[PDB]
Design an enzyme around this catalytic site. Structure first.
Site, short mmCIF file in Angstrom:
data_model
loop_
_atom_site.label_atom_id
_atom_site.label_comp_id
_atom_site.label_asym_id
_atom_site.label_seq_id
_atom_site.Cartn_x
_atom_site.Cartn_y
_atom_site.Cartn_z
N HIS A 90 0.85 -1.18 0.00
CA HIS A 90 0.00 0.00 0.00
C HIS A 90 0.89 1.23 0.00
O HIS A 90 1.70 1.41 0.91
CB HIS A 90 -0.95 0.02 1.20
CG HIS A 90 -1.87 1.20 1.21
ND1 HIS A 90 -3.14 1.16 0.66
CD2 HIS A 90 -1.72 2.45 1.69
CE1 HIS A 90 -3.72 2.33 0.80
NE2 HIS A 90 -2.88 3.14 1.42
N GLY A 91 0.74 2.07 -1.02
CA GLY A 91 1.47 3.31 -1.11
C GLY A 91 0.60 4.51 -0.79
O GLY A 91 -0.62 4.47 -0.93
N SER A 92 1.25 5.58 -0.35
CA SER A 92 0.55 6.81 -0.02
C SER A 92 1.57 7.93 0.11
O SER A 92 2.74 7.68 0.44
CB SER A 92 -0.25 6.68 1.28
OG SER A 92 -1.00 7.85 1.54
N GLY A 99 -0.46 10.09 9.92
CA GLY A 99 -1.82 9.74 10.28
C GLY A 99 -2.10 8.25 10.16
O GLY A 99 -2.72 7.66 11.05
N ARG A 106 -7.94 3.74 6.46
CA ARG A 106 -9.36 4.02 6.60
C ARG A 106 -10.00 4.10 5.22
O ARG A 106 -9.32 4.19 4.19
CB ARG A 106 -9.61 5.32 7.37
CG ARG A 106 -9.17 5.28 8.82
CD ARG A 106 -9.65 6.53 9.56
NE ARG A 106 -9.27 6.53 10.96
CZ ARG A 106 -9.99 5.98 11.94
NH1 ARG A 106 -11.14 5.38 11.70
NH2 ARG A 106 -9.53 6.04 13.19
N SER A 132 1.95 0.28 -6.19
CA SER A 132 1.70 1.04 -4.97
C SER A 132 2.70 2.17 -4.79
O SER A 132 2.33 3.26 -4.35
CB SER A 132 1.73 0.10 -3.76
OG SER A 132 0.66 -0.82 -3.79
N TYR A 135 1.96 5.65 -5.92
CA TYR A 135 1.12 6.52 -5.09
C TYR A 135 1.90 7.24 -4.00
O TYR A 135 1.33 8.10 -3.32
CB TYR A 135 -0.02 5.71 -4.47
CG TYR A 135 -1.06 5.26 -5.46
CD1 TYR A 135 -2.09 6.11 -5.86
CD2 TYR A 135 -1.02 3.98 -6.02
CE1 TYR A 135 -3.04 5.70 -6.77
CE2 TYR A 135 -1.97 3.57 -6.93
CZ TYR A 135 -2.98 4.43 -7.30
OH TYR A 135 -3.93 4.02 -8.21
N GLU A 216 -5.49 -5.71 -8.47
CA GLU A 216 -5.80 -4.88 -7.32
C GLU A 216 -6.57 -5.72 -6.31
O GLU A 216 -7.36 -6.58 -6.69
CB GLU A 216 -6.63 -3.65 -7.71
CG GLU A 216 -5.93 -2.67 -8.65
CD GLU A 216 -6.71 -1.39 -8.84
OE1 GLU A 216 -7.73 -1.20 -8.15
OE2 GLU A 216 -6.30 -0.56 -9.68
N1 LIG Z 1 -2.14 3.03 -3.15
C1 LIG Z 1 -2.25 1.73 -3.36
O1 LIG Z 1 -1.62 0.90 -2.70
C2 LIG Z 1 -3.19 1.27 -4.43
C3 LIG Z 1 -2.96 0.05 -5.07
C4 LIG Z 1 -3.81 -0.42 -6.07
C5 LIG Z 1 -4.92 0.32 -6.47
C6 LIG Z 1 -5.14 1.54 -5.83
N2 LIG Z 1 -6.15 2.48 -5.97
C7 LIG Z 1 -5.89 3.47 -5.06
C8 LIG Z 1 -6.78 4.62 -4.85
C9 LIG Z 1 -8.12 4.56 -5.22
C10 LIG Z 1 -8.97 5.62 -4.95
C11 LIG Z 1 -8.49 6.75 -4.32
C12 LIG Z 1 -7.15 6.83 -3.95
C13 LIG Z 1 -6.63 8.05 -3.26
O2 LIG Z 1 -6.64 9.12 -3.83
N3 LIG Z 1 -6.16 7.92 -2.00
C14 LIG Z 1 -7.06 7.85 -0.84
C15 LIG Z 1 -6.35 8.30 0.43
N4 LIG Z 1 -5.12 7.50 0.54
C16 LIG Z 1 -4.30 7.25 -0.52
N5 LIG Z 1 -3.28 6.52 -0.17
N6 LIG Z 1 -3.41 6.25 1.20
C17 LIG Z 1 -4.52 6.85 1.59
C18 LIG Z 1 -5.03 6.79 3.00
F1 LIG Z 1 -6.13 6.05 3.10
F2 LIG Z 1 -4.15 6.26 3.83
F3 LIG Z 1 -5.34 8.00 3.47
C19 LIG Z 1 -4.70 7.84 -1.83
C20 LIG Z 1 -6.30 5.76 -4.22
N7 LIG Z 1 -4.79 3.24 -4.36
C21 LIG Z 1 -4.31 2.02 -4.83
#
Ligand SMILES: NC(=O)c1cccc2[nH]c(-c3cccc(C(=O)N4CCn5c(nnc5C(F)(F)F)C4)c3)nc12
Length: 237
Positions: A90-92, A99, A106, A132, A135, A216
Site C-alpha cells: 500500500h502506497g501513499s 496519520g 481508513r 503502490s 502513489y 488490485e
Molecule cells: N495506493 C495503493 O496501494 C493502491 C494500489 C492499487 C490500487 C489503488 N487504488 C488506489 C486509490 C483509489 C482511490 C483513491 C485513492 C486516493 O486518492 N487515495 C485515498 C487516500 N489515501 C491514498 N493513499 N493512502 C490513503 C489513506 F487512506 F491512507 F489515506 C490515496 C487511491 N490506491 C491504490
C-alpha cells in the site's frame, strides 16, 4: 533520545521533540536487521514484483521497520483464521503516514464521490510493489517515500475484470480482486507466518478481457487489515 537512529530519521520524515513525536503515533516501530531472513524476503518481494510499465524509476530499499499499531491485532483477530491471507503493498504520499500509523488505514466517508474509486470506497492494495509505490508520488527533488506491507484477510474474492464503483459485496464475499493481465508467479509464492507472500516474478495471468494491467485487492472493513512492515524507498530515475 533512546530511539535507534533509523527510527528517529523516520520520525523526522513523517513529522517534518523526537520521542514525543514517536509517542504521538501510538505505534510500536522496530527496525528489521539487514541480514535477517525477514529482510531478504521483503527485498525479494520488492525485487521481483516491479512492473515493466513502471520503468520511470528504479526502487531500492533503505530501511525496513516492523510496525505494530495499538489495538490493530485485537481488532484484526476475528478475521485471522479467514483463509486466503496475503501480504500486500500500500502506497501513499509521505505526509499521510503520520496519520496512517496513528489512525490506521481508513475508508473514504460514506458520502464522498464514488467516482475515482474504481471498485468503490474501500482499502486498496497491490501485489506489484511499483503499482503502490506510484502513489508515494516521490519526484527527483524528493525521491524518498514510504510504503506499507499489510496482512489482508482477502477471504472469498469477488473477481472483477472491469470497474464497479460500488462498496457492497454479494453476500458470501469478503474482498474484491481486480484481475490484472500480469500477476506474480504463483509457483514462487511462500507462506510467511501463515500469510501468503506472492513474491513471484511477473507472468501472464491468462486473462485477456480485463481493464487492469496488474491485480488490485480491495477490502471494505478496515479490520480485514493488519499493517506488518513499513519501508523507506529510494526512487532512482
Ligand atoms: N495506493 C495503493 O496501494 C493502491 C494500489 C492499487 C490500487 C489503488 N487504488 C488506489 C486509490 C483509489 C482511490 C483513491 C485513492 C486516493 O486518492 N487515495 C485515498 C487516500 N489515501 C491514498 N493513499 N493512502 C490513503 C489513506 F487512506 F491512507 F489515506 C490515496 C487511491 N490506491 C491504490
Amino acid at each position: 533520545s533512546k530511539l535507534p537512529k533509523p527510527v528517529q530519521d523516520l520520525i523526522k520524515m513523517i513529522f517534518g521533540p523526537i520521542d514525543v513525536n514517536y509517542e504521538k503515533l501510538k505505534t510500536d516501530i522496530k527496525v528489521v536487521d539487514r541480514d535477517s531472513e525477514e529482510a531478504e524476503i521483503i527485498r525479494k518481494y520488492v525485487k521481483n514484483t516491479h512492473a515493466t510499465t513502471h520503468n520511470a524509476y528504479d526502487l531500492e530499499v533503505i530501511d525496513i521497520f516492523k510496525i505494530e499499531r495499538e489495538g490493530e491485532c485485537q481488532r484484526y483477530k476475528p478475521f485471522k483464521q479467514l483463509h486466503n491471507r496475503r501480504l500486500l503493498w500500500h502506497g501513499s504520499r509521505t505526509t499521510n503516514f503520520a496519520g496512517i500509523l496513528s489512525q490506521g488505514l481508513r475508508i473514504a466517508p460514506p458520502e464522498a464521490p464514488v467516482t475515482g474509486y474504481m471498485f468503490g470506497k474501500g482499502i486498496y492494495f497491490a501485489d506489484m510493489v511499483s503499482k503502490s509505490a506510484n502513489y508515494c508520488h516521490t519526484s527527483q527533488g524528493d525521491p524518498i517515500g514510504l510504503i506499507l506491507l499489510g496482512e489482508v484477510a482477502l477471504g472469498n474474492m469477488y473477481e472483477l475484470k472491469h470497474a464497479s464503483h460500488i462498496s457492497k459485496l454479494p453476500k458470501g464475499k469478503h474482498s474484491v480482486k481486480g484481475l490484472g493481465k500480469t500477476t506474480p508467479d504463483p509457483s514462487a509464492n511462500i507462506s510467511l507466518d501463515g500469510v501468503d507472500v506472492p513474491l513471484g516474478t511477473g507472468i501472464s495471468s491468462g486473462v485477456n478481457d480485463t481493464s487492469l494491467l496488474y491485480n488490485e485487492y480491495i477490502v471494505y472493513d478496515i479490520a480485514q487489515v493488519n499493517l506488518k512492515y513499513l519501508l523507506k524507498l529510494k526512487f532512482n530515475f
